[PDB]
Amino acid sequence: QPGVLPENMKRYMGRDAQRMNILAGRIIAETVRSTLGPKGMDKMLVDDLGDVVVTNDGVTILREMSVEHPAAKMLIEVAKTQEKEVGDGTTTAVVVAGELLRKAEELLDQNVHPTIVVKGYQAAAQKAQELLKTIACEVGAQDKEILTKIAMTSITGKGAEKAKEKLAEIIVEAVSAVVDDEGKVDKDLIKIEKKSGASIDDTELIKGVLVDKERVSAQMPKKVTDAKIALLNCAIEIKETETDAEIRITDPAKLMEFIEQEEKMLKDMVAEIKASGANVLFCQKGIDDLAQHYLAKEGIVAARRVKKSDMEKLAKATGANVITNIKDLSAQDLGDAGLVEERKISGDSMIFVEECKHPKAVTMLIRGTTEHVIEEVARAVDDAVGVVGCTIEDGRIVSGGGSTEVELSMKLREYAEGISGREQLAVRAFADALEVIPRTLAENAGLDAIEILVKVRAAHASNGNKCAGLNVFTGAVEDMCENGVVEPLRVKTQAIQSAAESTEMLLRIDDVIAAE
Amino acid sequence: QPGVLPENMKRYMGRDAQRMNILAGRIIAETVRSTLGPKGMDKMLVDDLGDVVVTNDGVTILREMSVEHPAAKMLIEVAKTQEKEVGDGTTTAVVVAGELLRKAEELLDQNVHPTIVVKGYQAAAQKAQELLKTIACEVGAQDKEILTKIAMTSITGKGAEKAKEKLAEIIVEAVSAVVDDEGKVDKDLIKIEKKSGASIDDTELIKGVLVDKERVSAQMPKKVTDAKIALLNCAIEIKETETDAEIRITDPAKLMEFIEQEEKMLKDMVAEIKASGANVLFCQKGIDDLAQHYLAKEGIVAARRVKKSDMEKLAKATGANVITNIKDLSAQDLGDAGLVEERKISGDSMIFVEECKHPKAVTMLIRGTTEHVIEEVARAVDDAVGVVGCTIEDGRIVSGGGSTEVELSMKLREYAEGISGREQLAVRAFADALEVIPRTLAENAGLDAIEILVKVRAAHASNGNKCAGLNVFTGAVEDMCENGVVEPLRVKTQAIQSAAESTEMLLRIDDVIAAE
Amino acid sequence: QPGVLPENMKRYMGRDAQRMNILAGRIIAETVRSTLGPKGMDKMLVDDLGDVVVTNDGVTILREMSVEHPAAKMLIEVAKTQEKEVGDGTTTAVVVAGELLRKAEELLDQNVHPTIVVKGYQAAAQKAQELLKTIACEVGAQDKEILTKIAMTSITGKGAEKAKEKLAEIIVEAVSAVVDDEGKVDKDLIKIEKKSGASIDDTELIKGVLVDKERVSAQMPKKVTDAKIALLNCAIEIKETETDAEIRITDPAKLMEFIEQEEKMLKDMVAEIKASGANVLFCQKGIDDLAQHYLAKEGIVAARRVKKSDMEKLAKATGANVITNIKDLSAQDLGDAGLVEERKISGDSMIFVEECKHPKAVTMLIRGTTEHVIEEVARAVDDAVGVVGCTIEDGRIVSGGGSTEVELSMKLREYAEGISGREQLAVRAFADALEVIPRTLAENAGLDAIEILVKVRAAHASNGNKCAGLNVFTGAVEDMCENGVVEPLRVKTQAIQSAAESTEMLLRIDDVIAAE
Ligand SMILES: Nc1ncnc2c1ncn2[C@@H]1O[C@H](COP(=O)(O)OP(=O)(O)O)[C@@H](O)[C@H]1O
Ligand SMILES: Nc1ncnc2c1ncn2[C@@H]1O[C@H](COP(=O)(O)OP(=O)(O)O)[C@@H](O)[C@H]1O
Ligand SMILES: Nc1ncnc2c1ncn2[C@@H]1O[C@H](COP(=O)(O)OP(=O)(O)O)[C@@H](O)[C@H]1O
């Protein structure tokens, strides 16, 4: 009598399961296609709270639409990974994924079994990775001209693109500055600050850091040049034993003596600081109001309760050692900056620590007229920082504008010739799926995809040009490398690998069991 | 401020409109594919009232699912037309239609504009009609051997197929009998009766008609041989003027005289009937109880209030003229039958009018153990009656089992070679769409569609055999004409034309506006 | 204290009123733009009952969306009028109207007062009517080649366009046949019948009429050649005085005598009919069952209770006089038809009265696979019948494909040069508004409107070609007159006048007061 599997449950099997997933994928892909490339357009997303995000950024859009559909969630993971590993090409990856799903449907409607499609995809994907390596050009991690093209390509189609030359130079300087001694780039050592102002061109690089604290006492200097900075993360307050201790006073005179002893301990703390040669002081903990006095009388700029993250970046920029024992503070622990100034910026008072010599962290101060405008500039700067970092780390790049996908597509078909059996249809499918990129670029530019594809495919055939792609302005096939349209090899390798792995995962599903 | 278009309304534009329709079509198609062919399976459909229909019949299924979706409704119209014009191939037509929609999607995703797809389809469809004429064989409307194969093919895969030889012979006799003098077949002159009994083999042809009435008075004979039948659709009651008239009686004696005068009028009516030589009488109106008496005294079998439809078929079978004036009833108006008997059949008393000489209407009495079993036998008999009728009328047939579709497909591709431009992709699409039939046949038989298609396509290429199709039992390509697997040209021509016109109609839609 | 004007009321003044109307107009226009021209697309409209309409037809769409917005309702009236007066160009007229509203907004945002805009529009419109007369070519009401181009142009872009040559010839024959002796065309004498069948090419012209009634008695002939038809709209039943009358019978013998007298009156009625020479009889009233007998004995085909509208059209086709006194029926009242046949069509029995000699009414029998497909063919046939009628009546045509609007636009700008003052801006606005047609045609064809407009405008400038328009296939400016793309002058004159009058009406509104 009673039901075995839960009654409160929907279930989709075989064809229905496949359709459910394929459909979800395609629909996710279709909602971001319009954003792709130079003539890409932006979405405005409103949440249930009435908050607005306007952005071109693929993965951002996908996160902000609060998608519940279980298969869509899988595709969105593709975009999230692309973001983590590369920082660019999120839309590309998702769109390729959707296309693989769509091409898989044609094969499944012919009765090719899912596992065979999967097998075929896996083969094509491996081959694509191999081909992508032969396709990439080598570049040096210090080739600023090429790094700058990498950044500018990233910003193309973003609306921040109006300022792409200036932005790219700044971004290339910034990333170059924080490259560690193992040759790696930590996106975190480039602090992004966002502040309203006259325009986007007011955006600047700061060799140093911005600190959202003010000097602890107005009697201290507001400005100081060639400063010797002290980083202290112990507190400048009267020290207190760990074991519970209480004073007992029985003589009225001894009353003052304890107060005075405490005042002296504090005076001594400041004197030890002065002795190191420091004129500027950032402290992670608190500073007794009396110590604040003494510091000011010594002409020392001090800030209290500085964010741990701030101390860590201040250290990186100036060469200072964060100290936990005032007793052990020497001149060798002090950091150095050309200028430390408290000044206002968009009506906020902050402490600028700038003109450091060889900073290991820096600040990109992004400026624009309005908050939402800035936010999007920032999102674009993030994309560029990403790919510039990838290039510096990998030393491998490829041409953009769909050229690489077409070359890939063309070679994969050659590969498919030698595949025997049904698996072959899957390999050709995979090949054809890649052309979604050059097609969408044209589509978004109001061009005719079918004919441009014909033209671009031709320029790649024989022993033609792997760099040939559609210029969505002139309408001609051009040499994208010569035009400076390039991207890190890592964008393509990741996007394709991600799309392949996730669609293979979905195509293996023959049963969906949803609850509640 | 206020909304222009109604607020209580959903709307789907461009891509969304196309998907909505394409999807609906495909889903309708997919729900009947499983029924197609020799290894086709049946659906059991339950309505909101708890009534059951189990059937293989495509259009029946689609009517019984109470489909609300507006695009689906359009596809269902394809099945309904096929039923009206042919009586068979409803599943085929719907499945082809779905396939055309699916192939259209691939072209639309490449950015081929809908109107171009449409144009292409129209071309292919016209070409197909031309090709179908050259593909058809001629047959004579009196070729019983070929007509019998036509019927048997129809019944294959129906469960009534257990009795297909017997059924086919009966069906062919039946249709042959009602062919008019212009060579046309009216499916209506073959009355189908359904009655439970020992088995389906008890099913028989009746040269004559079954009447659901009993003789009007038990004093009349139950049986009568070589009968002279009278058809009267005026009433045997006392006649009454149209102008209002009343009798006035003032003399007591004249009281009887009026009653007697009426009795005489009735006696005279019967005597006029006897004088024509009639021993059996069917009357469309009523018969005064006194006339019933006189008729019985004269040994005349009479039935009253016979359905107009019954009178009309009785007339067609026996050669009688339905008369409206008893005065004008002569022996030349009488019909003839070998046997008129009232007898029981499944516990029901009815009047059999059988063994007529050259009947122009006839009765197929269908027998089976249970109601739902009979119903389906009947549905199959209907299909066969249809195609036999089509063959007799058209004189053109083609080979079955997917052979004709494959030949069509192959030729249409040849045609497409000479199409310049984008329209060509649509023509090839159309061609490939047709192969859904041979694919589904194999699929339903658990065979591998991809390889059998390869084999069948090969048998058709060069100057091979237009009759080559997959035998879903042996697994081989065989000569379907030699195996007696044939269908009226009209089933292919209509199915294809219907699918083409309705999918073209849908593909022209770019906006869906639904209310409430 | 209490409110003066009703409290349950919204109100929009000045700017808000203007925006409300302008907006409504534009939105209505925008919903039908997509349907315009050769590459136009169709909408699928679902009502609250779940009934579907799929159509390209502008005014049909606007009627089926149940639009409540008060200003939209006004624009819809534009479409309805175009339908009544012309039968084609409904979309054109509505789109022009929207455009006038949009161009009016630009002028209102510059602070040009509404009345001045209005004044300007009125001037432009009057000028346009004058210019349209000089632009039109003359044609003879019997120039079948030109009438045929007119029809084909009409059907272009409709999906019935697949059969446009055949359809056009039939339509031209049909309209030509019903032209009266004052040279006018009543669209009502061309009866449209819709019946499913093998395909749209089965569509045919019937010189005569279809009657949905079967012969009254099966004993009558089903077919009859060179028939003499009798039209009777009195009844063939026993006549009854107006003054109340009753028979009194006192003698039993006189009983029969009254019945017989009535039978004789009926026999006499039939005999009088036979005497006129008639073999076929259509009666608007009833026919006594006994008369039906006598008629059949005389070999006369008769139908009873024929729709008044049917009698009227039967008369028009055959040359018969509908008679109300059987006594006064002579041979000169009889009509003539080559063939009168009762036969089946899509499983329906009807009476065909065809092959009449010089019919003054005819039937277009439209055929297609499915109901919704047919409906739309019919809608297109209606459009063509309309413009063919217009041409025959007016004798004036103009070139299509936007050429005329461009010529108009160009001349109206010339006119505006000599307008002094602000009114001038309104005249140039009007001029520019007309270009919405050539723009939308291109747009719908995926072409670039801005550049094609530049090209077309050039071909018209100087003393160029008034017939020059965009070919939306080749992409070139071509001679639309040479390509046979033509329309009745009435389509442009009415569309423009309608748009002008209704937008002027709306622009005069400064206050909207809505209730409830
Ligand atoms: N100047 C250009 N011309 C053509 N294509 C370009 C140009 N600049 C960038 N692209 C292409 O646009 C695509 C990336 O666009 P974008 O909207 O940033 O998507 P994603 O989120 O996937 O990076 C890449 O194929 C890139 O090569
Ligand atoms: N013996 C057979 N072998 C292969 N195919 C057959 C055979 N008999 C019938 N068919 C095919 O089955 C199809 C019709 O199957 P059916 O289930 O009746 O569908 P429909 O409702 O479309 O007629 C036709 O394509 C016909 O060629
Ligand atoms: N072959 C053609 N080439 C270009 N334009 C055409 C052609 N045939 C018709 N047209 C144009 O299409 C327009 C009519 O389109 P249609 O969708 O019927 O709208 P409407 O309901 O307003 O008549 C007219 O401007 C006519 O000139």
Ligand SMILES: [Mg+2]
């Ligand atoms: Mg990018």
Ligand SMILES: [Mg+2]
């Ligand atoms: Mg069948």
Ligand SMILES: [Mg+2]
């Ligand atoms: Mg039109």
